[PDB]
Every structure is written in structure tokens, then in C-alpha cells.
Design a protein around this ligand. Sequence first.
Ligand SMILES: CCc1c(-c2cccc3[nH]ccc23)[nH]c(C(=O)O)c1-c1ccccc1Cl
Ligand SMILES: [Zn+2]
Ligand SMILES: [Zn+2]
Ligand SMILES: [Zn+2]
Ligand SMILES: [Zn+2]
Lengths: 100, 99
Amino acid sequence: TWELSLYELQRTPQEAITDGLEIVVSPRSLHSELMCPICLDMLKNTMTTKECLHRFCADCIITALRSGNKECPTCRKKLVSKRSLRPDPNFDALISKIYP
Amino acid sequence: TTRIKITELNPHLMCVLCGGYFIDATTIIECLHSFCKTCIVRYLETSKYCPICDVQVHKTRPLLNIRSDKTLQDIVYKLVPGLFKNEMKRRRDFYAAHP
Ligand SMILES: CCc1c(-c2cccc3[nH]ccc23)[nH]c(C(=O)O)c1-c1ccccc1Cl
Ligand SMILES: [Zn+2]
Ligand SMILES: [Zn+2]
Ligand SMILES: [Zn+2]
Ligand SMILES: [Zn+2]
């Protein structure tokens, strides 16, 4: 269930930043979130599992399910069907901003 | 390593209902669109279709096909300086006034 707590019921927007500050980002920074745990490089052609929202490479995920475990390599949950895999364009849209 | 103007990322880090950054980021597992947890729950109280792409989330129970996106929410808390401080402090303040 998605019941909203008292806080969530009355929470306000978190105002965004128009100021034009700049953040510094190394290939190491945020790496825990951007690395395909298959190939440990940058996500290219991202895929996401619909049951658990886990991202992998399109070219990489085909081989991990090919080696006989049919679960999600991250949370170890049975990956049902084939429609559980969708390419993630809104996520690759994000990679293209961070070449290193 | 590069430096990026945050005005360049704000599209990828903002809820179209809230006009602000994602807090408790949540994702429709059909179209991979994402909104604040509270924003989309209130939205889906009146529509079974995505606010942006306009797909049908479900014929009957829309909440069935949305998941937390902690992977996405973590990217926000890391790129946006002190957003996590600010949001956590907001919640303490609340429960300091409502026990
Ligand atoms: C990534 C794998 C996968 C699946 C799928 C989903 C769930 C279990 C699966 N076990 C084998 C595959 C597969 N379904 C699809 C699909 O889109 O048809 C894919 C897929 C996605 C992109 C490119 C190539 C393929 Cl085959
Ligand atoms: Zn990969
Ligand atoms: Zn998973
Ligand atoms: Zn929002
Ligand atoms: Zn959508």
C-alpha cells in the first residue's frame, strides 16, 4: 500500500535551483549508480527490470540470463516473462550529459 | 571530471507535477516516467494514465504498476547539494511539531 504519512500528505515542493551553480563530477563519483554490475563500465543502451527498476546494459543483460539463473542479478528475484525488460530512453538521456 | 551547470540537469531531476526536484522518487514501470512519490499517488487517484506520455498504467488499479526508484532518487541527492539535508531537516521539523 501507498498510504501517505502526515508529512507526505502536506509536503511542499523542494524548490529547484535557477542560480546556475556548477557541480563537479568525476568518473568515480556516482559510480555506484551508473555502472552495469555485469561489465563495470558506463551503461550503454540501458535496460530496466519492471519488477524492481534495476538498470543494465541491453547488450550485457542477454548473457547473464543466458547463464542459467533467470533472476535479477541485483536483488536475486525471479525475472518473469520477456516483457519485464524495457529499454530506458529517459535514462540514456541522462548519460549523454556526463561523457566522463 | 567535468563541471556542469545544474540548469542543464534540472530537466532530468525534476517532477513535472511539483515543479521541483524529486523527493521519494517513484516510477511507472511501463513507460519509465518518474515523479515524486506523493505527486504521482495523488495523480493516480484520478487517472489511470501517465501525466506525460499518456499511457494507461492499468485498467483498474494504477498503483499496481509503479515502483520506488531509489536508483534515481540517489542520483538526485548526490548531484543536488544539500537537498538531502534540506529534505531530512524538513521532516524532523514536522514531527517536532506533530507528535
Ligand atoms: C534483455 C533480455 C530481454 C528480455 C527478457 C526479459 C526477461 C527475461 C529474459 N530472458 C531472456 C530475455 C529476457 N526480453 C527482451 C525483449 O525486449 O524482448 C529482452 C531484450 C531486450 C533488449 C535486447 C534484447 C533482448 Cl532479448
Ligand atoms: Zn554492461
Ligand atoms: Zn532486481
Ligand atoms: Zn513532485
Ligand atoms: Zn509515461
